[PDB]
């Protein structure tokens, strides 16, 4: 049972998941002096249908907002991709204090949290379960979240957490378009990488937005007030769930800008 504390956390994951020491691990530090501008990168195109929003779930280490993924009502196109990728989930990472919490860093700078919008390749594969281990199977948009003014676009998500306070609790989460959470500019970096927690499959093409979005200290506190224990047990707040950055191992981070 992997986790984020010192006994089961990122620096121990390799004992159970050897790919943690792989060549395409995520997240990474994006050194902007070493990025390579790619004129062939197309703009990112997201077209999400709010009716595909399904459920919010406390998964112990985090919470997930899941989407109906039976058809192409909600898709990501463009960027480095030739195929269409079908939305299936968004979630966040945060840290114990505001000084850290993002997974990716930019020129060594740690942000307070990070939003992940995850999709799977429905052009080549028939299900998330099939796509999840394929090198071209997953596409995840990462948005760095900078502490500052309260972000009103997070409201529906934050209001839902009171119904999923403890591990395993699930509740309907409907009529929501998560493209409303993205920054106004979709200038981006991209690199081949991995899921940032077990099973750490090197199946993710990362799209990291250049522009951050805001989040307030109190909104971050709502994340950390989620409980990792099951109802009835001693309360264990979800203090943090971000993985440290990993070596590029010769990968190249491309810039759309
Ligand atoms: N932080 S992330 O790298 O952007 C990222 C992106 C997408 C999914 C996850 N994790 C989870 O969805 N966990 C809950 C269910 N686990 C089964 C599973 C295995 C492989 C792929 C999807 C689902 C993490
Ligand atoms: Zn994530």
Say how far apart CA 230 and CA 233 lie, in whole Å.
6
Buried (b) or exposed (e) across 101-120, using 16+ Cβ within 10 A? Answer: bbbbbbeeebbbbbbbbbbb
Question: Helix count (H) and strand count (E) of the chain?
Answer: 4, 15
Experimental method: X-ray
93 is in an annotated binding site: yes
Q: Can you point out the beta strands (E) in 11-153?
A: 29-30, 36-37, 44-47, 53-58, 63-67, 75-78, 85-94, 105-106, 113-121, 138-147
| Residue owning the nearest CA to atom 3 of ligand 1 | 195
* Calculated CA dihedral for residues 180, 183, 184, 186, nearest 10 degrees: -110
Domain extent for 49: 1-257
What's the chain's length in residues? 257
Mind giving me the DSSP string for 105-119?
EETTB--SEEEEEEE
Resolution in angstroms for this experimental structure? 1.5
- Please give the structure tokens belonging to residue 96: 């114990």
Counted domains in the chain: 1
Which positions are catalytic? 61
Residues just before a chain gap in the chain (C–N exceeding 2.5 Å) are: none
Distances in Å between the Cα of 211 and the Cα atoms of 148, 150, 199 are 14, 16, 29
**Ligand 1 environment, Cβ below 6 A:** 59, 89, 116, 118, 128, 132, 140, 195-197, 199, 201, 204
- Closest ligand to C-alpha of residue 114 is 2
């Amino acid at each position: 049972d992997w986790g984020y504390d010192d006994k089961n956390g990122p620096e121990q994951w390799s004992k159970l998941y050897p790919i943690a020491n792989g060549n395409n691990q995520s997240p990474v530090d994006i050194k902007t002096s070493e990025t390579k501008h790619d004129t062939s990168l197309k703009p990112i195109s997201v077209s999400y249908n709010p009716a595909t929003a399904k459920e919010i779930i406390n998964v112990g280490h985090s919470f997930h907002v899941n989407f109906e993924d039976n058809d192409n009502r909600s898709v990501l196109k463009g960027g480095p991709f030739s195929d269409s990728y079908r939305l299936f989930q968004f979630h966040f990472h945060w840290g114990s204090t505001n000084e850290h919490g993002s997974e990716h860093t930019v020129d060594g700078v740690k942000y307070s949290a990070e939003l992940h919008v995850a999709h799977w390749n429905s052009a080549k594969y028939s299900s998330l379960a099939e796509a999840a281990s394929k090198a071209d199977g997953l596409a995840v948009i990462g948005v760095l979240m900078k502490v500052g003014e309260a972000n009103p676009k997070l409201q529906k998500v934050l209001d839902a957490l009171q119904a999923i306070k403890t591990k395993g609790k699930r509740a309907p989460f409907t009529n929501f378009d998560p493209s409303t959470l993205l920054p106004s500019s979709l200038d981006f970096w991209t690199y081949p990488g991995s899921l940032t927690h077990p099973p750490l499959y090197e199946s993710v093409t990362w799209i990291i937005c250049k522009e951050s979005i805001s989040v307030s200290s109190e909104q971050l506190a709502q994340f950390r007030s989620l409980l990792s224990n099951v109802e009835g047990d001693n309360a264990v707040p979800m203090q943090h769930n971000n993985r440290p950055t990993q070596p590029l191992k010769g990968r190249t981070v491309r810039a759309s800008f």
